[PDB]
């Protein structure tokens, strides 16, 4: 009936190692499931765990199962940006399976000699929205926004490919004024010291 999944959300560095968890009533256990769920796509069967003490493991990923004190860990060894996604957990009730809250995971890619810097970009209708841009945005904050009320922020960490190195964790902010003002649009955040302003 109840499939708890914890923690709900975690950001970890590239190359680090987490190991989230999913616990369930051990009463009437028969089988367990794990799913990789890439953001905005279909969930995808990862493991199918059944017997006690048995420890399935695929790629840099693994899993255990303790059917008596109802729990299962999902470990990730040397972790990668690609391994970012919401990980789900289901147990039977029919003939049925009941998914847990689901644990969303982000893996922030670290960088070839980081270039923390803030830039401003103008539109094509002269002076409007002049989007702000924060390259190599350090994620010590990354809660949601920053200095926001009549400002909009959609900073998110992405990846490839390769030529002069590329793993996209920038940030971006804009508004309805143009009187907005970059190099100032990221207040509620706690950016680094070497951050670079061109004016």
């Amino acid at each position: 009936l109840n499939v708890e999944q914890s923690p709900q959300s975690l950001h970890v560095q590239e190359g680090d190692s987490t190991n989230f968890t999913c616990s369930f009533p051990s009463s009437n256990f028969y089988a367990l499931h794990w799913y990789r769920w890439e953001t905005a796509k279909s969930p995808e069967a990862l493991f199918v765990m059944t017997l006690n003490g048995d420890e399935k493991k695929k790629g840099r990923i693994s899993a255990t199962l303790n059917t008596k004190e109802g729990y299962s860990y999902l470990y990730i060894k040397g972790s990668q940006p690609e391994d970012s996604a919401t990980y789900l957990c289901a147990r039977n009730t029919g003939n049925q399976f009941y998914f847990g809250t689901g644990t969303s995971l982000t893996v922030i890619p670290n960088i070839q000699n980081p270039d923390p810097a803030v830039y401003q970009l103008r539109d094509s209708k002269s002076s409007d929205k002049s989007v702000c841009l924060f390259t190599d945005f350090d994620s010590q904050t990354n809660v949601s926004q920053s200095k926001d009320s009549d400002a909009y922020i959609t900073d998110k960490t992405v990846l490839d490919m390769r030529s002069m190195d590329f793993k996209s964790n920038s940030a971006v902010a804009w508004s309805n004024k143009s009187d907005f003002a970059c190099a100032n649009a990221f207040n509620n955040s706690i950016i680094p010291e070497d951050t670079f302003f061109p004016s």
């Binding site: 499931h33 279909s42 689901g102 830039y119 989007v131 490919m161 002069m164 590329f166």
Partner: protein, 243 residues
């Protein structure tokens, strides 16, 4: 694979009914519908253990289904309530009472609005690489920004000279409310295209992000002064420059 599921996106005027189509071609006995709403993840609606057999789930209220055949498991929404806004999935598995994992359908995004009045197409805009980013690390970055749309049904691509590029692009995973307070908010979507500083310096190039919006159909009543917010593409284009 696999489980084909139609349609992808959909807007509905409260009280309107609808059939969600999902079909498989693998002889999977078991088929089921889950919905998705933040905080509870996947909750089960109606499930089906074989042809002719249908059975209720965690949250069956307001939906019904049929299974006269092995392949299809249609989700009919009797009478749309605004609490029927959600993301739907159709999942199947080979053997009933078996342990196999569910191979999931594509998924469909459903928004149930009071008045179709609430539907807005987006406004795509492109933004020239920082003339100081090039002078710093020798890289150029184009930013595409779509704003003020509802509901959050869009696909954002780019186009160099006329080819759909995936190299170097980083879109947002999901549209964001302009201000999470609250439901008068439209949605937002951005993408960075980072290419060589000297490749955007080349004025011969035609950069273009496009955004397909999924909205109204010439079919729903349209009685407002503004354009009809149908399904349609919208593009902000640009050219390189060494000036």
């Amino acid at each position: 694979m696999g489980v084909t599921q139609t349609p992808k996106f959909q807007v509905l005027k409260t009280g309107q009914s609808m059939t969600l189509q999902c079909a498989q071609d693998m002889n999977h006995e078991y088929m089921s519908w889950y919905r998705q709403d933040p905080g509870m993840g996947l909750r089960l609606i109606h499930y089906s253990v074989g042809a002719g057999i249908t059975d209720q789930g965690e949250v069956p209220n307001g939906y019904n289904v049929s299974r006269s055949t092995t392949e299809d498991f249609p989700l009919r929404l009797l009478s749309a309530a605004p609490s029927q806004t959600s993301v739907y999935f159709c999942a199947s598995s080979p053997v009933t009472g078996g342990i196999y994992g569910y191979t999931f359908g594509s998924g469909t995004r459903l928004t149930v609005v009071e008045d179709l009045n609430k539907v807005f197409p987006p406004e795509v805009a492109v933004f020239e690489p920082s003339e100081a980013e090039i002078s710093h690390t020798q890289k150029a970055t184009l930013v595409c920004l779509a704003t003020g749309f509802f509901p959050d049904h869009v696909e954002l691509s780019w186009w160099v000279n006329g080819k759909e590029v995936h190299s170097g692009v980083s879109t947002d995973p999901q549209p964001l409310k302009e201000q999470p307070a609250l439901n008068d908010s439209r949605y937002c979507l951005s993408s960075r295209l980072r290419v060589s500083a000297t490749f955007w310096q080349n004025p011969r190039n035609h950069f273009r992000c496009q955004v397909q919006f999924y909205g109204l159909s010439e079919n729903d009543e349209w009685t407002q002064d503004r354009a009809k917010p149908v399904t349609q593409i919208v593009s902000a284009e640009a050219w390189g420059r060494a000036d």
